[PDB]
Symmetry: C3
Subunit: 333 residues, 3 copies
């Protein structure tokens, strides 16, 4: 049975952190139990006060990252409080059958349901809400996150060597379609339902008004930067459930990258910029060699700097003059 196996509970943590877990494991399959509560709310998504009638898993954008090993069974309890207004569900791209779980988790406000599925394929996978007749709206409103399924003996390079990371960070990139008035000012709506008709008009143009990391412009900049040390190896998980993106680290590289996100395939190395297909999650490894501030962004630079898709990584350590050196500071010709 797929049931009899040990059952364990995981306590989910908010982006950009990832809950504690082991990379390689000497241990057999288990049933990992997770709980997620849906939360509809109006959020401030920029520095000028623009608002979004948003829909979330666990109150954040993106939803939390769930991590298990290849072979485990995922047991998710999805709860939809009576304070919400819309029906919701989940679609795990890492699962097999019934529209990824969506058919078995239709949950109206005040209901809950429990689904179990075998995670028999390795990689980072997107999960998202997908209620019949309104999938694009719930996804674009914030309902997505990642499931990471690690190979039981950890991540490997192309020749089979072991690859380790010291920390993992999870970034969700969201293309947002906030309507504008005649003024040229973004609209504010009193209820979620009221935002609907205008939002679908903007969606159909295919031109986002804002593209943000983790829920807002500047979520991961300045004081909210990601942090690391030179010599530390970081796993950067990047998901985009609806639209393509092309991540890049200014002053760094993707040492080892799975741009399609599936760990059974060999990774590519030394990438300047990688590509995550809308509807998927990818992963990149990097080891910091120089201290200082780094920017992590979508390298359509108008999308990064005008629309919002950019973040910071602040790195501690000692400068290395052999890698890079200013021989002549700026001066008069």
């Amino acid at each position: 049975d797929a049931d009899k196996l040990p059952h364990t509970k995981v306590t989910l943590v908010a982006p950009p952190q990832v809950h504690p877990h082991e990379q390689a494991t000497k241990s057999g399959p288990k049933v990992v139990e997770f709980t997620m509560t849906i939360e509809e709310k109006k959020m401030v998504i920029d520095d000028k006060g623009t608002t979004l009638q948003a829909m979330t898993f666990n109150g954040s954008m993106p939803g939390p990252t769930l991590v298990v090993h290849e072979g485990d069974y995922v047991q998710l309890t999805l709860v939809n409080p009576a304070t919400n207004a819309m029906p919701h569900n989940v679609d795990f791209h890492g699962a097999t059958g019934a529209l990824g779980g969506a058919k078995l988790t239709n949950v109206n406000p005040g209901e809950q349901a429990t689904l179990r599925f075998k995670a028999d394929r390795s990689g980072t996978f997107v999960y998202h809400c997908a209620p019949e007749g309104m999938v694009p709206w719930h996804v674009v409103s914030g309902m997505s996150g990642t499931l990471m399924v690690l190979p039981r003996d950890g991540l490997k390079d192309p020749q089979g060597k072991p690859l380790h990371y010291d920390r993992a960070y999870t970034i969700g990139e969201f293309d947002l379609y906030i309507p504008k008035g005649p003024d040229g000012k973004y609209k504010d709506y009193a209820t979620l339902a009221e935002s609907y008709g205008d939002t679908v008009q903007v969606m159909r143009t295919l031109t986002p008004s804002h593209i943000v990391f983790n829920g807002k412009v500047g979520a991961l900049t300045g004081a909210d930067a990601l942090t690391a040390k030179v010599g530390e190896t970081v796993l950067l998980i990047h998901s985009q459930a609806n639209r393509d993106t092309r991540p890049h680290l200014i002053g760094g590289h993707g040492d080892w990258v799975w741009e399609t996100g599936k760990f059974a395939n060999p990774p590519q190395r030394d990438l300047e910029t990688w590509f995550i297909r809308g509807g998927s999650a990818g992963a990149a490894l990097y080891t910091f060699k120089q201290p200082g501030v780094y920017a992590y962004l979508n390298h359509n630079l108008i999308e990064a700097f005008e629309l919002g898709a950019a973040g910071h990584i602040k790195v501690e350590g000692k400068w290395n003059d052999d890698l890079m050196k200013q021989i002549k500071a700026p001066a008069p010709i």
Copy 2:
């Protein structure tokens, strides 16, 4: 000679089916003869009656898939009836020299021409019309399809193991640019030529009005779904001659995928969502493990659910409770 070799004729079949053929073959090179007749017509492309002044190879969108083995010679007779109004030609991406065949097949209404080219490279390749001064228009109006060139000893995995499919289905994804009036209603034109000027204005915005599989919204849904059985392996051929797309199977995966479409390269596995570059055809293999209805779509979900790029696969068989199981149906908290 490349001529002396046996000559054989193939009878072309309409999408989404593919004409009978062998995967591995113990047999030498041959000259495969195919005939295609161009057909200009006005087609209904949605469920609300919107019309398109369309241009086709053999009366369908996409044109039929032609399948040969690596080493064969393709011998195509292109016919352009006197009832059409425009000159046409063909450009095979699988061919070498003279703009892919386009320079040797310029055929005015009432003319025909015969081209022969060696298919010396393995994979799925796009073919499309390409008349000087109006290529984008003929392509966007429906003139494209796929040529599949199989390795003589069939498809293989990365370690060289044999890979087989039970059935093959061919999907053509078309980005359409139908002008709108002041009303906000799509225009209807009496002739093909009359549609031209407005259509090029819409094309230049780069925003399609509709994105459809095989000629219309709902072509492959409900009663027109693709069909399969659990334990059956299907080859899903996907072409897009002008614009990128990112195919995904809800509740399934791409077991083995050639997203750039060329069989001499190793395939990737366990993909949630793959990517077909505009101007190319890719291929994915999957084996059904669970019965039920599956959706096959472009995972920019606004493109799939608002603009039309989505289809269904209806699968017969027995549920497998170990893969997925509802432990607690929806109920009150």
Copy 3:
């Protein structure tokens, strides 16, 4: 030291040519010195007289390609004449640390600075201007080019065999955002600074007005075609610092392609159409087998034929009838 090593100077050449260099080298690391002067100017970017208030490295779009071997140190002297109006800098994606060099090269009009960085990773890399608060504008105005870092023992295939090229050509693809008036005519500005506000409005739509190869519509067509001979192998370097593109050679293929551009990874073969992620440079090898005119373009065909992203290659040699042959010229049915 990284200094003590021999120092050598390279004389930069204009696109589409690449300065003389060796592929494999039996020689150790050196310090290669290069000099680039920034040049702001108004350029004519089409055949109808449209103008662009452009910004360049060395007076061309794209900037010149710099080529070194893996292990060398790049020593760039960046000069910004007193005749320019804006501050500039450089960001090498091939470098590690301080925003790719951008923090150490901030150069106001009338200043110069010298940076040295180790090129420890193999491939074609984009370099671009990136001044704080205005990066998208300087990039989109023309400030980008490629750095090619060759493996010390040359390019290799997947099984390790040596791969050689006879000539290399460098193509920069630029998405341009030239504002339009009420008339429907493109605006002309007296100064660079005056173009700014309108340009950022057009950028935010994400819809280029023009997409060109090397600075203008028709830069590489007709009399300006690239040239080759049958039996010759060409390396086609393609960079796009802001926006995706999907290169294709009509009548040819990418024999061996590094679409993500990094030489330590195995290349893919027999590609009809490849993909360069915005923010990166890729490379493809091809050997001409048939004489005649070839087109090299972005296979979103509206982008290629309406917006400008298309070029020509004129090939000398003898027709090969086995590859392709017209058996029946166009004639009456």
